[PDB]
Design a protein around this ligand. Structure first.
Ligand SMILES: CCCCCCCCCCC/C=C\CCCCC(=O)O
Ligand SMILES: CCCCCCCCCCC/C=C\CCCCC(=O)O
Ligand SMILES: CCCCCCCCCCCC(=O)O
Ligand SMILES: CCCCCCCCCCCC(=O)O
Ligand SMILES: CCCCCCCC(=O)O
Ligand SMILES: CCCCCCCC(=O)O
Ligand SMILES: CCCCCCCC(=O)O
Ligand SMILES: CCCCCCCC(=O)O
Ligand SMILES: CCCCCC(=O)O
Ligand SMILES: CCCCCC(=O)O
Ligand SMILES: CCCCCC(=O)O
Ligand SMILES: CCCCCC(=O)O
Ligand SMILES: [Ca+2]
Ligand SMILES: [Ca+2]
Ligand SMILES: [Cl-]
Ligand SMILES: [Cl-]
Ligand SMILES: [Cl-]
Ligand SMILES: [Cl-]
Ligand SMILES: [Mg+2]
Ligand SMILES: [Zn+2]
Ligand SMILES: [Zn+2]
Lengths: 382, 382
């Protein structure tokens, strides 16, 4: 039936909420009002989905959730990980989009921003498992998630990243991950865990769900003991240069996977060689753009608003090849880096910059269809 | 010892709330965060004020309120007017900014947008009074406001208008004044009349104040009988082409007053000769800009977002002269029309377009100081 033989799963980044989990008023993540990615691609006969994973959690937590989003079942972050970081072992349970997902039944993975890192980690787990969990289950018995065992291949056809901070962002190091702003984020998470909340910001495994008969006062007191407040097992840490380097250091290339990256630039050079945001950079990224743009290291300056070009092109010191827009992007095992999209800020990739009339719905439609064409090419050249 | 011998009163337009009457979070009307008109002009030694008058009411109601804001005392809309339109005769009471205001002790009046019409009407009443009120008091005795008597000259030195719809706006005829949107506006007014509200949207004379012991249910029922719902005595009517023409038809030039207008353009011509909003037009005016810009009549197309250029230049039936930026704007009795400000949308005049980095604080400071320079020269050439 579907034009694509392998389902396409779109994976949101940091802060992203999709589907039923999005607030009463909130942007449509995948395409804004410019091009409704899921609805329009389905209309054209493609089998596509938008994953729903933790908005504030670590790449680790998100990758586990991605696995269960696809496969179905109760999220298991692993006994060793849970014990190390101090959060629940078990999380939400997903219906599962492909309950029969197993070697042979592949999926295409496309990540926006942090979603691009989450996708890399999950594939890491399928192929190589998680050594701390393998060791823990060796030593202590129990059950180990099949996600953590290793030896699961032929499950992902492709990894495509849009404005992914593969090498981290100074906007995390110098803003997102500062103590002051972690506190803001964690307070939001505490609040949206209240007993009248219908939205899950992705840190409930840390205790941020108020019980039906618990007072707010008691809730505050209970969750102030959580390790979340000082942990590095969260998104803000993972998005720093160091946090992202750690992920780069534990990933490897899969020779069967087609890897491709897209990157935008939305800054311009000033007289001193610093980068400032273009008019048209979605305004909430003006300061973050300036922070990145004023880096001491010149090659870390050009940026899409919140991710420097050098972070998005490809993980540092993984194999890559610069590719043209026209040619087949059908090489396996190597990051195919697409030419930089001029004027595209971080959120232009998902169409939510409603203030930017230069970035048209029809342009965004062509961009997404071009990704699907590449994915079809991957399938055709198996 | 202020530098200006006559106080300057700045008069906000439609929707404008100032000072104590502005919501918890709300822009600073005169200058935004770009150039704090009142505070900065005072720092430079000028005696300036921002009037507070009805945000949603008619030019008539607003002109009465402006009078009392300056002079002090209990607002009196006039017995005849109250009876004709079906609202209270008496309104709020103002401390008064110049309790000694009288022939000889003059004020400079500067109006943004609708404020420019309000200022014209008030001066009309001072000079020629209000015949229906004079007649009514003749017939029925009682008191008549000094505002409605006529014969008050030498009270206003100058009328300066910024982006004033002297000839109305299609955005009112085709949107603002439609039944569906009057209902929205009147509902907001009903709500902000609730017994916990600290902000006055300027329609309380129509019944929109909930009593301390009145239920919301009873309030709804009581104010649905008000004539506001079907009256033309409101801002939305007055801003239409017809509503503004009516004001033009009953006002006249005062040969002792210095008149000056400023106008902005923030649209550009397309291939069919229609006008579309520039990038940089504050986004909430995008649709209104397009409605104006697609007018059948070509000369009614160019616009600042919500006011077409031909509306802002001068009242269509009144004498004007095009003036250069460098001419002393000291001719009396004739609309001195200042060269159009290219790239200035309707709200760039008051500095609130926080999304538009092309329009800088230092530019806005020069613009306001230039108005004060003109006002000084009016005083010097008496
Ligand atoms: C609240 C603090 C913001 C800190 C910013 C840190 C750096 C961010 C780099 C990229 C993060 C990952 C995905 C970005 C997703 C964008 C989604 C959205 O705008 O709704
Ligand atoms: C809610 C409906 C708005 C419809 C627009 C009608 C036409 C408006 C023409 C000029 C309006 C007069 C004063 C404009 C004052 C602007 C103040 C502000 O934006 O904070
Ligand atoms: C739009 C932001 C509103 C500002 C509220 C500040 C509250 C700070 C921390 C609140 C934590 C909580 O409510 O559990
Ligand atoms: C800005 C929030 C929008 C909510 C729209 C619903 C309101 C309908 C009319 C309300 C009238 C009233 O509450 O008196
Ligand atoms: C035309 C859309 C109406 C504005 C409400 C949407 C609020 C939001 O952006 O979250
Ligand atoms: C402004 C708060 C309104 C709802 C509080 C619910 C009371 C409870 O927790 O038992
Ligand atoms: C909950 C606060 C209500 C804000 C009213 C805004 C008035 C205006 O638009 O002029
Ligand atoms: C809806 C939240 C607050 C309503 C207050 C009611 C007061 C009253 O009507 O006596
Ligand atoms: C009530 C609104 C919560 C917004 C959560 C977010 O920014 O992802
Ligand atoms: C135009 C701004 C309205 C916001 C009103 C408030 O939240 O107090
Ligand atoms: C009349 C009691 C409720 C009105 C106040 C409010 O809606 O906040
Ligand atoms: C002046 C306010 C009108 C809102 C029009 C819009 O958002 O399309
Ligand atoms: Ca943009
Ligand atoms: Ca503007
Ligand atoms: Cl499996
Ligand atoms: Cl929840
Ligand atoms: Cl008087
Ligand atoms: Cl009130
Ligand atoms: Mg919900
Ligand atoms: Zn974790
Ligand atoms: Zn009235």
């Amino acid at each position: 039936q579907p034009l694509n033989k392998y389902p396409v799963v779109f994976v949101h980044g940091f802060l992203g909420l999709v589907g039923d989990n999005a607030p009463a008023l909130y942007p449509n993540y995948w395409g804004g009002n410019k091009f409704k990615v899921i609805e329009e691609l389905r209309k054209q006969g493609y089998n596509v989905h938008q994953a729903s994973v933790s908005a504030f959690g670590s790449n680790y937590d998100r990758a586990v959730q991605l696995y269960y989003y696809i496969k179905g079942g109760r999220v298991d972050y692993g006994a060793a990980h849970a014990a190390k970081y101090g959060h629940e072992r078990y999380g939400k349970t997903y219906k599962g989009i492909m309950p029969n997902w197993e070697p042979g039944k592949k999926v295409h993975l496309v990540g926006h921003a942090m979603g691009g890192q989450t996708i890399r980690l999950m594939e890491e787990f399928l192929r190589n498992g998680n050594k701390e969990e393998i060791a823990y289950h060796q030593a202590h018995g129990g059950e180990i998630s099949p996600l953590f065992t290793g030896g699961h291949n032929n499950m992902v056809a492709s990894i495509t990243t849009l404005a992914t901070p593969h090498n981290g962002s100074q906007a995390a190091d110098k803003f997102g991950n500062t103590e002051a702003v972690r506190k803001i984020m964690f307070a939001l998470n505490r609040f949206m865990g209240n007993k009248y909340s219908n939205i899950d910001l992705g840190l409930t495994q840390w205790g941020f769900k108020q019980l039906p008969n618990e007072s707010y006062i008691d809730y505050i007191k209970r969750v102030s003991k959580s390790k979340i407040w000082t942990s590095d097992d969260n998104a803000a840490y993972d998005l720093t240069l160091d946090g992202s380097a750690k992920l780069n250091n534990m990933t490897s290339m899969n020779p069967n996977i087609t890897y491709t990256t897209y990157t935008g630039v939305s800054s311009h050079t000033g007289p001193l060689g610093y980068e400032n945001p273009d008019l048209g950079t979605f305004f909430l990224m003006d300061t973050t753009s300036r922070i990145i743009g004023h880096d001491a290291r010149e090659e870390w300056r050009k940026n899409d608003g919140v991710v420097p070009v050098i972070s998005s092109l490809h993980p540092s010191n993984q194999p890559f090849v610069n590719v043209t827009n026209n040619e087949p992007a059908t090489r396996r095992g190597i990051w195919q880096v697409k030419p930089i999209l001029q004027g595209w800020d971080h959120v232009d990739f998902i169409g939510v910059d409603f203030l930017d009339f230069k970035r048209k719905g029809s342009e965004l439609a062509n961009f997404y269809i071009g990704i699907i064409n590449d994915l079809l090419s991957v399938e055709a050249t198996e």
